[PDB]
Design an enzyme around this catalytic site. Structure first.
Site, mmCIF file in Angstrom:
data_model
loop_
_atom_site.group_PDB
_atom_site.id
_atom_site.type_symbol
_atom_site.label_atom_id
_atom_site.label_comp_id
_atom_site.label_asym_id
_atom_site.label_seq_id
_atom_site.Cartn_x
_atom_site.Cartn_y
_atom_site.Cartn_z
ATOM 1 N N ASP B 121 -45.709 -112.112 12.847
ATOM 2 C CA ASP B 121 -46.606 -113.261 12.928
ATOM 3 C C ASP B 121 -46.834 -113.731 14.390
ATOM 4 O OD1 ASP B 121 -48.191 -115.513 12.252
ATOM 5 O OD2 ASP B 121 -46.465 -116.713 11.604
ATOM 6 N N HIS B 250 -40.831 -127.000 -23.740
ATOM 7 C CA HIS B 250 -41.182 -127.500 -25.062
ATOM 8 C C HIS B 250 -40.324 -128.784 -25.301
ATOM 9 C CE1 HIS B 250 -37.150 -126.143 -26.122
ATOM 10 N NE2 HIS B 250 -37.416 -125.119 -25.306
ATOM 11 N N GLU B 319 -39.210 -117.186 -24.051
ATOM 12 C CA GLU B 319 -37.886 -117.348 -23.458
ATOM 13 C C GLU B 319 -37.186 -115.991 -23.308
ATOM 14 O OE1 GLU B 319 -36.349 -118.620 -21.375
ATOM 15 O OE2 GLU B 319 -34.844 -120.115 -21.949
HETATM 16 O O1 LIG Z 1 -29.709 -118.653 -18.680
HETATM 17 P P1 LIG Z 1 -29.103 -119.815 -19.465
HETATM 18 O O2 LIG Z 1 -28.518 -120.911 -18.596
HETATM 19 O O3 LIG Z 1 -28.179 -119.321 -20.552
HETATM 20 O O4 LIG Z 1 -30.365 -120.521 -20.176
HETATM 21 C C1 LIG Z 1 -31.286 -119.808 -21.025
HETATM 22 C C2 LIG Z 1 -31.112 -120.379 -22.426
HETATM 23 O O5 LIG Z 1 -31.622 -121.721 -22.487
HETATM 24 C C3 LIG Z 1 -32.313 -121.920 -23.729
HETATM 25 O O6 LIG Z 1 -33.742 -121.912 -23.503
HETATM 26 C C4 LIG Z 1 -31.915 -123.284 -24.321
HETATM 27 O O7 LIG Z 1 -30.526 -123.312 -24.660
HETATM 28 C C5 LIG Z 1 -31.917 -120.690 -24.577
HETATM 29 O O8 LIG Z 1 -32.896 -120.401 -25.565
HETATM 30 C C6 LIG Z 1 -31.811 -119.592 -23.536
HETATM 31 O O9 LIG Z 1 -31.020 -118.463 -23.934
#
Ligand SMILES: O=P(O)(O)OC[C@H]1O[C@](O)(CO)[C@@H](O)[C@@H]1O
Ligand SMILES: Cn1cc(-c2cn(C)c3ccc(Oc4ccc(NC(=O)[C@@H]5CCCN5)cc4)cc23)cn1
Ligand SMILES: Cn1cc(-c2cn(C)c3ccc(Oc4ccc(NC(=O)[C@@H]5CCCN5)cc4)cc23)cn1
Ligand SMILES: O=P(O)(O)OC[C@H]1O[C@](O)(CO)[C@@H](O)[C@@H]1O
Lengths: 442, 442
Positions: B121, B250, B319
């Site tokens: 840069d 959610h 998720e």
């Molecule tokens: O990576 P960590 O801290 O286990 O969090 C992910 C988790 O959190 C949640 O979205 C809520 O508990 C689970 O569905 C998912 O496995």
């Protein structure tokens, strides 16, 4: 309050639709006209066909409208380049009528048939013709995106595109040398009136890409949306260099012997024999710099291990996820989940296994694999039945409806070679017995 | 024959390594130097920082080497533009020494520290300086890719980039008006010797992109590999228009109440209250054309349903897949799979659940979400804890090691605003109670 139901086939959560006494339908983003621009033998049809194959495969309904095809329908037999003379008053009128007829079909396709992208494959070499196309798009609420291919005469001659051009039905009653001589004279007919796209002045407000000298350079002006940006990215990844793509499944595994789906089982004794036969086949091909790709599942990696060549594991190549049906036989699925079994048989492309995937999901996962395959030269992909059907549907231009039924047997190499506007496919069975995992449509 | 073992953390099948009596290590593709080019206030530092943030997040180790930072270290305090005068023999020498020192660090980074991309840069406005950089790359076996930003003076002034430029420590002891006046005079120092990239003649063999007038047009010459093609695609998707990104999970669901991971459960009574509070918050923001994105899981869709706004479901926002651990509590995981529980706690980013995913897998799935988020203006993303940590790590430039521990509570909106070379983050708790799902590092 916030009451949802999961759709039976695709497993999509949707609000419960308690339709009133008189159910009403709200029947049925802006469509795009891709305007090809340039002299004949500039690879415009090659680009049109490649983009359409990619866009349909990712799920964007696309169709090519080639003005020369309308011309061949309106005029029974092609005699010579004299038809393309700028002083041919009659043929100039016929050619304009064909372009207007193709545009009428573009309008019907985008405004009434559910099309999203129409590729207008013609020379469109004058500002007058392009202004007319812009008026047609503006009056119909279509976006216009121009793709011009500019290339000097020695580069065109060296590219060997004219051998594809002279394979046209226009030259059915011609030998190679005279068809080549006639096509050369045809190009010269377009040179005097050709006004290239000028983003510096006259075309500063148009969305366009100029592909210069078979992709050595690009000029990109006013990219408006994601599909234009994606097309530019695709054009920067494809190439015209000669190469071979080999596709095969892992050697027969222990789940295959039990008729079990999914899982992560290892090769059976026959699967190990196929892996040895694959190493011998690969050695006999005598390829320069073969890239080898596998999934992250055991059976493909054990198959690649027999080659004694470096390989890369892609999670995107893992077999379709059968969710709650993983490691079950089809008989166990029919008996435990009879409703799921019947729904899949009826809509195999869109059907999603519970907590699993559909072939539609596989296409989305596989798009970076396709993009990288376009960039590469010699590649061997060792994968799985549903993944292989998806990749094969892209190379062989097969629809979403036929994709889940494509025949991809075990212990068989599918050898793909780029020829004209697609792939030649040669099947090579490596003479090692296995079970059959193909299930025809009900 | 073809004996493999599955790695404990990443779950990768690898050949059994029965190392001989004297185990030997083979310790340790060609690295790239991205050369920024152009006059001051052309957004070169903005591009450098954005590209580096994207490249590190997708997993390509990248670092910026800013010559001005080396200069500030070598010269205690900045007095004025007189330092940048082309007749300042002493300062010209110091400035060259700083560029050579930065290049020594580029060499150490790429050849010894495991770096893959170094962003150089600086103005690099003369052919002499660029020839010298090309010699450095050629002698070290590094690829060179040039990114030039060309913009006229009114467009620079209208862009408001100079307000970011005058926020530099060079102007610590200055008021806004005098710092602005000095910076203007500084730009004028570079104009006489500026030789722009010329792909038509002198720079025809160089791999480069010219970004013209803040992305209105691009010139792309000799794209060599996938990372150059990807950078061009990224530059065509980003923009400098003002907008807001809202990120939230959610509303609380039934699995959250039971301490259960994964699954596809619906909102609890509190989760439904949060969904109502979210609709009111969204209404109060009074945004022009808000785009709403959800995952394909029930809890995010029920949350979006309370907004009474159109929304799009992305499977890429689902998720993280816990594989065999789906729908278990963390206590049930520790008791049923104690080895898996301990491995995850020790390497949370790279750990892959059996038949499931890692945060590393989530990044790959989420890259098209990030690309589309760059293109959009006002967007609300309703997602899940691990997905939200990944997206937040991209916007806030957080490493892979910190990403799985980022705090993303339930019923809380994270409001992101583009400011200078990043995002301002404002947290808005919508005053609805919920369980806590955050688990600190052991
Ligand atoms: O990576 P960590 O801290 O286990 O969090 C992910 C988790 O959190 C949640 O979205 C809520 O508990 C689970 O569905 C998912 O496995
Ligand atoms: C099948 N085939 C097509 C041609 C052909 C000839 N000419 C004169 C052409 C001009 C353009 C053309 O279409 C493209 C050619 C190349 C590219 N892209 C590329 O080459 C990218 C950029 C740099 C790395 N690879 C994109 C489109 C293709 C051709 C020759 N054989
Ligand atoms: C944060 N900030 C940066 C600037 C800025 C000023 N000037 C003179 C600049 C010049 C270039 C620059 O960097 C880019 C700006 C825009 C783009 N891309 C785009 O705008 C794409 C293409 C068309 C659709 N969106 C890519 C890079 C950014 C700037 C102004 N504010
Ligand atoms: O879509 P189909 O015809 O069920 O084929 C996909 C199946 O084929 C297999 O690869 C082999 O049986 C299974 O693992 C997978 O579920």
């Amino acid at each position: 309050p916030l009451e949802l139901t999961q759709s039976r086939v695709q497993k999509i959560w949707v609000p419960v639709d308690h339709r009133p006494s008189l159910p009403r339908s709200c029947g049925p983003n802006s469509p795009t006209v891709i305007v090809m621009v340039g002299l004949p033998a500039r690879g415009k049809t090659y680009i049109s066909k490649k983009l359409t194959r990619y866009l349909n495969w990712i799920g964007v309904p696309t169709k090519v409208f080639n003005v020369g095809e309308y011309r061949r329908e309106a005029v029974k037999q092609y005699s010579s380049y004299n038809f393309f003379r700028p002083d041919n008053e009659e043929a100039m009128k016929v050619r304009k009528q064909c372009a207007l007829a193709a545009l009428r079909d573009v309008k019907s396709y985008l405004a009434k048939e559910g099309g999203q992208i129409a590729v207008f494959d013609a020379t469109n070499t004058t500002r007058e013709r392009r202004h007319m196309i812009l008026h047609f798009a503006k009056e119909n609420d279509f976006k216009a995106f121009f793709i011009e291919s500019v290339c000097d005469d020695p580069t065109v001659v060296a590219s060997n595109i004219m051998e594809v051009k002279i394979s046209s039905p226009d030259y059915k009653d011609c030998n190679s040398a005279e068809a080549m001589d006639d096509f050369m004279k045809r190009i010269s007919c377009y040179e005097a009136s050709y006004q290239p796209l000028d983003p510096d002045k006259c075309d500063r407000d148009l969305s366009l890409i100029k592909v210069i000298d078979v992709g050595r350079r690009f000029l990109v002006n006013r990219v408006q949306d994601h599909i234009q940006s994606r097309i530019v990215y695709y054009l920067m990844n494809i190439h015209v260099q000669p190469r071979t793509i080999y596709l095969c499944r892992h050697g027969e595994n222990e789940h295959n012997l039990q008729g079990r789906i999914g899982g992560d089982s290892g090769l059976s004794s026959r699967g190990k024999k196929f892996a040895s036969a694959l190493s011998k086949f690969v050695e006999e091909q005598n390829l320069k710099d073969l890239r080898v790709w596998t999934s992250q599942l055991k059976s493909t990696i054990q198959t690649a291990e027999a080659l004694r060549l470096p390989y890369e594991q892609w999670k995107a190549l893992n077999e379709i996820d059968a969710g709650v049906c993983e490691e079950l036989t089809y008989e166990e699925i029919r008996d435990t989940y009879p409703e799921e079994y019947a729904l899949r048989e009826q809509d195999k492309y869109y059907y999603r296994y519970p907590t699993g995937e559909s072939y539609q999901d596989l296409v989305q996962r596989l798009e970076p694999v396709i993009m990288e395959l376009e960039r590469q030269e010699n590649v061997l992909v060792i994968c799985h039945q549903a993944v292989l059907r998806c990749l094969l549907a892209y190379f062989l231009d097969k629809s979403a409806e036929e994709m889940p039924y494509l025949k991809c047997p075990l212990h068989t190499v599918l050898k793909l070679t780029p020829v004209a506007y697609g792939c030649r496919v040669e099947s090579i069975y490596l003479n090692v017995e296995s079970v059959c995992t193909h299930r025809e449509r009900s």
